[PDB]
Each structure stands twice: as structure tokens, then as C-alpha cells.
Amino acid sequence: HDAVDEFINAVETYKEVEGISDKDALKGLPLLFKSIAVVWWKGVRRDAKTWSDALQLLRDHFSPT
Amino acid sequence: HDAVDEFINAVETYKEVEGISDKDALKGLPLLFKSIAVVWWKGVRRDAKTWSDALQLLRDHFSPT
């Protein structure tokens, strides 16, 4: 139940829900989740001041519009 | 159910299971999950050749010994 196990569950859930192949996943998912993680950390070191505002922020950054 | 939502669930599960405060979590968890993500990507661009070997790898890197 450590952080690494929860990280892997996220990646594997996403691979499953999106029906991504093992080959496309190996090629693509490490950089995608690396980008998410960097953006989250970047937006906390820049702006966010709260825990709820650190979560919400990452969403608004990957926004539908 | 996108990647960002699964990422947030991982972080929030970890915060909950470990009983981390909002203040310690804001300060600490973005860099921790950023590190995990970087290590995973690093170990795929270096060594791993398979999907099961990309998962397993990240574990062995955060190894108990």
C-alpha cells in the first residue's frame, strides 16, 4: 500500500480503461504520468497554498477547453 | 477516469493510509510522486523491454533492502 503500489494501480487502471496495448503503454505511459506529476509539483511550488487547491489545480490544468 | 483522476486517487489513498496531514502532504507528496514517476520513466528508457518488466522494475528500485 505504499506510494509506488498506488502509482502502479493508477497507471494500470488507466491502461485498462483506455484499452491501451502493452507496447503502446510502455512507449507512452511513463512520459504521460511523468508529465502529470511534474505539472502537479510545478503548480504547487508556483501557486497552490492548500491541499484541496493542489488537487483541484491539477485538474484545471488538464482542462477540457 | 482519465490519467489525472487516477493519479489523484493514488496520492489521496497514500495520504489516507499513511495518515499524512494536509500540510505535510502539500509540502511532501508532489516531490515524492514526481520522483516515482521520474524513476519509472528513467528505468524504462534505460533497461525495461516489456510492460510487466516496467512495472516490476519500479518496485525493485524502491526495494526494502
Numbering used by the authors:
A (entry chain A), B (entry chain A): 9 to 73
Published text:
One of the key proteins in long-term synaptic plasticity and memory is the activity-regulated cytoskeleton-associated protein (Arc). Drosophila has two isoforms of Arc, dArc1 and dArc2, with low sequence similarity to mammalian Arc, but lacking a large N-terminal domain. Both dArc isoforms are related to the Ty3/gypsy retrotransposon capsid, consisting of N- and C-terminal lobes. As opposed to the corresponding mammalian Arc lobe domains, which are monomeric, the dArc lobes were all oligomeric in solution, indicating a strong propensity for homophilic interactions.
In our 1.90-Å crystal structure, dArc2-NL is a domain-swapped dimer, in which the second and third helix of the canonical lobe domain join to form an extended helix. One layer of the dimer is formed by α2 of each subunit, which pack at a cross angle of 140.7°. The other layer is formed by the remaining helices, and α1 lies in a groove formed between α2 and α3. The subunit interface of the dimer spans 3440 Å2 of buried surface area. The interface consists exclusively of π-π and van der Waals interactions, and the helices encapsulate a hydrophobic core between the monomers, formed by Phe51, Val55, Pro74, Phe77, Ile80, Trp84, Trp95, Leu99, Leu102, and Phe106. The solvent-exposed surface of the dimer is charged and polarized; the electrostatic surface potential of the side formed by the two coiled α2 helices is highly positive, while the opposite surface formed by α1 and α3 is mainly negative. Only a part of the tail (residues 37–45) was included in the dArc2-NL crystallized here, reflecting the fact that our experiments were carried out before structural information for the capsids and the importance of the N-terminal tail was available. In our structure, this fragment could not be resolved, due to flexibility. The binding surface for the N-terminal segment is buried at the interface of the dArc2-NL domain-swapped dimer. Taken together, the structure of dArc2-NL reveals an intrinsic property of the Arc lobe domain to form alternate dimers via domain swapping, possibly regulated through interactions of the folded dArc2-NL core domain with the N-terminal tail.
